[PDB]
């Protein structure tokens, strides 16, 4: 059976540029591909219904090509609109499958994160719940790694991560990490502590702090 | 015996949507008009839905008339029921019932009926948040955090829209509570902290929740 | 269609005769059935047609009436027919059931003994505080709990479970739980449960002081 | 402009089972084939499952093949996916799309999606349950408050079934965590509370937790 070999995982850009992404597939198909592009959270949307056969409605910037194994897509100057997922598929009678969707994104140098950790206010640790919040404020790429440590033990299922898309002013992601506890946990320890590693970075990046001072 | 199976029970909210399903073993459905009952809070029955042989009729009892619909497909042997726009009194056990007889008639009772599957609606349609600083360690960054609500969006600003550079609001996470969080965060001057007083202004849109909180050095 | 069932619980010995009674609000012809239904179990089919018994159906059970009024007897109850019955009108591609009635087994009037036990100090160290009130061997079933804080009657937090009569006596038990956060629980001192029951002439109150 | 509307998504526990469903509007879906799509947290496109026009032919992807059943009804317009014993890794957004183009063929992509609704399966398939002691203030009354344990049952004992006249286990309510919570409490002369001692022996099955606990008075 097909699987996509769809290439690169991600393409950096940036407004004006011409574009090309490759789909290859694993054992040949008859020129069965189609393109959709994917922005975040939302519904996929169809740009080519066959390969090279741009769909109605569609803007004239969008283009592809296909040999029966090895396929493109291609954008003929990025406007601010396209910096979103694209996917390749090969679409089948009763089945599909999809390439690993080339990430389009805008361009910048690397940046490393600037990091914060955020203690529980006492307001919330009344309650009886700790969150304890770590902040990568602004960095480039997207790709970065977030531990947590509790008196030096490392932490394995407490946090939650989520990461905010491209900053419209300088382009950078950022994340945070948030380590749940409750106050009779939270209060079996003293230091609290976020360790960093990203793109940028030489070492790895620690904040930390300890319970009450 | 003849076997009958239900899934997709459990806990829902006040304004939300939930599918039943039923399936079955020992039988073929397509014979059968099709029923969904349940077994309200004072321990009484009350009927929900039924469809007939070959899909024709749908009804269903006043309660439920058109905020539930019932599908069939025989091919594979199941039955479901669309829950949409749940309510308080909607919470019960649910079972799938076959309509029938030792020799199949114009009209029967309910003969083989399914182990049944709960269904509790929550009134819990629009629960607020609750609302946190987080407070600053030449820049700084402070923020507010947001725990425990439903359904989305919590909305934040910086002190009425007067401060916007820097300001990131981060993506909801889903907890194992069933529940969203989220954080919200600015970087500032450091040198700003002992004159400038940082507030978040916050509403939970759905239950209109409007909140504040002041964001300051602990 | 509507239909009304009486009495809504029928109390009776083992060995009796016994009539349940269901009132259709226009005719519906013969066209009711009978259901059983035990606790945490799907309905069981009875009779049909008014008065058709199901094959394997006992024959103590019988069913009679036509146009509005419809009754079901039960001929000699055995420990197995204690539960709860439904009337249910049937046509060609819809049904409606009545309200239920429920036999159980009759005895004297009991008072609940009531017990009101304070969280443990384990659990409220987790941040968490259950307060169970207790309602031991009473009858019959219908009991009422209200749970007030520093005079402050609860409502919304607390949920209720009752057991099945008792083999041996006949009687009925129930536990109610009051849950609230290590925060919640020491804003509060007393803690009380207020039972009203038809062997109680007069609300009986027990009650403990935080701490 | 056409649309879709994907239903019954939310939480759900690792081996438990959810059924989704989708409606559409602006067209029919009995002259379509009807497709279940995912995106995995990981970011990438799953195709899920297929039915055909007719509802004659029913696939899956191979890693849902077998524990999924898709579904439909041609006349109210609902397509279905019954999800049994789920996985961590069926987390992710589900949508569902219609396989189409302005002229339809026997091979066509999928020309209009839905919003999608997300899945997540928490990774906690039993949960084990906490035991606290009801400490004893004629005749006495203790027992133990079984907490926070899934699925059902829990069985409880007294003194390793030495001690049963006077026992009371009540059936189990759920809360609105999704968990369940039972108490077993027994009545005993108030004299053998100096010398007696009282064990509830707690075992819950689906988590393979045994717990011993003496309740003794405070
Ligand atoms: C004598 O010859 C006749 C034909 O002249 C033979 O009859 C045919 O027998 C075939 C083999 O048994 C059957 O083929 C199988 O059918 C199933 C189901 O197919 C359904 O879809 C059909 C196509 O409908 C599409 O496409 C048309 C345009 O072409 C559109 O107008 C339509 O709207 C619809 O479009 C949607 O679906 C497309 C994908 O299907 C999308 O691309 C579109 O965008 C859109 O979403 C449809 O015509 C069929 O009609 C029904 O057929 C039933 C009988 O099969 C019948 O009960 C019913 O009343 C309808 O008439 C179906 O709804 C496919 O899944 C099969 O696929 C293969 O399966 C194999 C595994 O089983 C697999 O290995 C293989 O790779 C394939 O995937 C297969 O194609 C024909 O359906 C059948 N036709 C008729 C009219 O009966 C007859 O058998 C032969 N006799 C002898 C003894 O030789
Ligand atoms: C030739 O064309 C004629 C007319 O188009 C067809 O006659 C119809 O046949 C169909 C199928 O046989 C009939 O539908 C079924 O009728 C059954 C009996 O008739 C009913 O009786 C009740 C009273 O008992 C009346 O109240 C109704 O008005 C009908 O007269 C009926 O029992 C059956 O019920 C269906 O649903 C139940 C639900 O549980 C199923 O259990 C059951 O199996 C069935 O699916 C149908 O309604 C239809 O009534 C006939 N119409 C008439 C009277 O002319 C011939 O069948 C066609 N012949 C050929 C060659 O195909
Ligand atoms: C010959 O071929 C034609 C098509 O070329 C078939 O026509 C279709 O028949 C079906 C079944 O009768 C029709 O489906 C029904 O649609 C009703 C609504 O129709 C109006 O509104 C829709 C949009 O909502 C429009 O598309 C349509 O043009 C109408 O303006 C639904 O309300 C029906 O549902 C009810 O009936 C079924 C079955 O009894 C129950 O299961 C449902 O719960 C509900 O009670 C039903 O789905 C379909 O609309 C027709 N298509 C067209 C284009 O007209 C013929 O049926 C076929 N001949 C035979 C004898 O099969």
């Known amino acids: 059976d097909v699987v996509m070999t769809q290439s690169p995982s991600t393409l950096s850009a940036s407004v004006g540029d011409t574009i090309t992404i490759t789909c290859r597939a694993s054992?040949?198909?008859?020129?069965?591909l189609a393109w959709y592009q994917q922005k975040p959270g939302k519904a996929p949307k169809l740009l080519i219904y066959?390969?090279?056969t741009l769909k109605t409605g569609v803007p004239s910037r969008f283009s592809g090509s296909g040999s029966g194994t090895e396929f493109t897509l291609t954008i003929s100057g990025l406007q601010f609109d396209d910096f979103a997922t694209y996917h390749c598929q090969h679409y089948a009678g009763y089945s599909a499958t999809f390439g690993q969707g080339t990430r389009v994104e805008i361009k910048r140098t690397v940046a490393a994160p600037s990091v914060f950790i955020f203690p529980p206010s006492d307001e919330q640790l009344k309650s009886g719940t700790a969150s304890v919040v770590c902040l990568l404020n602004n960095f480039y790429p997207r790709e970065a790694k977030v531990q947590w440590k509790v008196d030096n033990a490392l932490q394995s299922g407490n946090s939650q991560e989520s990461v905010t898309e491209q900053d419209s002013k300088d382009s950078t992601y950022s994340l945070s990490s948030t380590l749940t506890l409750s106050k009779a946990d939270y209060e079996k320890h003293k230091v609290y502590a976020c360790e960093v590693t990203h793109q940028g970075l030489s070492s790895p990046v620690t904040k930390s702090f300890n319970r009450g001072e | 015996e003849v076997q009958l199976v239900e899934s997709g029970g459990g806990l829902v909210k006040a304004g939300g949507s939930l599918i039943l399903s039923c399936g079955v073993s020992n039988f073929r459905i397509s014979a059968h008009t099709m029923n969904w009952v349940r077994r309200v809070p004072g321990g009484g029955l009350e009927w929900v839905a039924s469809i007939s042989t070959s899909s024709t009729y749908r009804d269903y009892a006043d309660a439920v008339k058109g905020r539930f619909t019932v599908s069939r497909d025989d091919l594979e042997d199941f039955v479901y029921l669309q829950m949409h726009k749940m309510r308080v009194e909607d919470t019960a056990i649910?079972?799938?019932?076959?309509?029938?007889?030792?020799?199949?008639?114009?009209?029967?009772?309910?003969?083989?009926?399914?182990?049944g599957t709960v269904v509790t609606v929550s009134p819990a349609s629009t629960k607020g948040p609750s609302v946190f600083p987080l407070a600053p360690s030449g820049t700084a960054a402070l923020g507010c955090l947001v725990k425990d609500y439903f359904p989305e969006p919590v909305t934040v600003s910086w002190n009425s829209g007067a401060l916007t550079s820097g300001v990131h609001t981060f993506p909801a996470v889903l907890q194992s509570s069933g529940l969203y969080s989220l954080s919200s965060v600015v970087t500032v001057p450091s040198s700003s902290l002992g004159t400038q007083t940082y507030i978040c202004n916050v509403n939970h849109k759905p239950s209109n929740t409007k909140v504040d909180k002041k964001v300051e050095p602990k | 269609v509507v239909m009304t069932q009486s009495p809504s619980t029928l109390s009776a010995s083992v060995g009796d005769t016994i009539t349940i009674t269901c009132?259709?609000?226009?005719?519906?012809?013969?066209?009711?059935?009978?259901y059983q239904q035990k606790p945490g179990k799907a309905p069981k089919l009875?009779?049909?047609?008014?008065?058709?018994?199901?094959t394997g159906v006992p024959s103590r059970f019988s069913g009679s009436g036509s146009g509005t009024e419809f009754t079901l007897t039960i001929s000699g109850l055995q420990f197995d027919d204690f539960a709860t019955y439904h009337c249910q009108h049937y046509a060609g591609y819809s049904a409606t059931f009545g309200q239920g009635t429920r036999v159980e087994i009759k005895r004297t009037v009991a008072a609940p003994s009531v017990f009101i036990f304070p969280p443990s100090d384990e659990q409220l160290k987790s941040g968490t505080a259950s307060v169970v009130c207790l309602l031991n061997n009473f009858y019959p079933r219908e009991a009422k709990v209200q749970w007030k804080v520093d005079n402050a009657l609860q409502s919304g937090n607390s949920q209720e479970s009752v057991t099945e009569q008792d083999s041996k006596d006949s009687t009925y038990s129930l536990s109610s739980t009051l849950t609230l956060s290590k925060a919640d629980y020491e804003k509060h001192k007393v803690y009380a449960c207020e039972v009203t029951h038809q062997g109680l002439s007069s609300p009986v109150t027990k009650s403990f002081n935080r701490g | 402009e056409v649309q879709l509307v994907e239903s019954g998504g939310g939480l759900v526990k690792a081996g438990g089972s959810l059924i989704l469903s989708c409606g559409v509007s602006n067209f029919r879906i009995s002259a379509h084939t009807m497709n279940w799509v995912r995106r995995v947290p990981g970011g990438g496109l799953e195709w899920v499952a297929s039915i055909s026009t007719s509802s004659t032919y029913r696939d899956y992807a191979d890693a849902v093949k077998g524990r999924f059943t898709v579904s439909r009804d041609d006349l109210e317009d609902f397509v279905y996916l019954q999800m049994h014993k789920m996985r961590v890794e069926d987390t992710a957004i589900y949508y569902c799309?219609?396989?189409?183009?302005?002229?339809?063929?026997?091979?066509?992509?999928?020309?209009?999606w839905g919003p999608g609704t997300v899945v997540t399966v928490s990774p906690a398939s039993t949960k084990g349950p906490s035991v606290f002691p009801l400490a004893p203030s004629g005749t006495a009354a203790l027992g133990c408050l079984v907490k926070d344990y899934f699925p059902e049952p829990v069985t409880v004992s007294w003194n390793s079934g030495a001690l049963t006249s006077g026992v009371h286990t009540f059936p189990a309510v759920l809360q609105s965590s999704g968990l369940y919570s039972l108490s077993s409490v027994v009545t005993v002369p108030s004299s053998s509370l100096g010398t007696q001692t009282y064990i509830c022996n707690v075992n819950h099955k689906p988590s393979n937790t045994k717990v011993d606990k003496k309740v003794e008075p405070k």
């Open positions: 799309a219609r396989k189409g183009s302005d002229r339809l063929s026997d091979n066509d992509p999928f020309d209009a």
């Open positions: 066959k390969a090279s």
């Open positions: 054992q040949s198909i008859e020129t069965w």
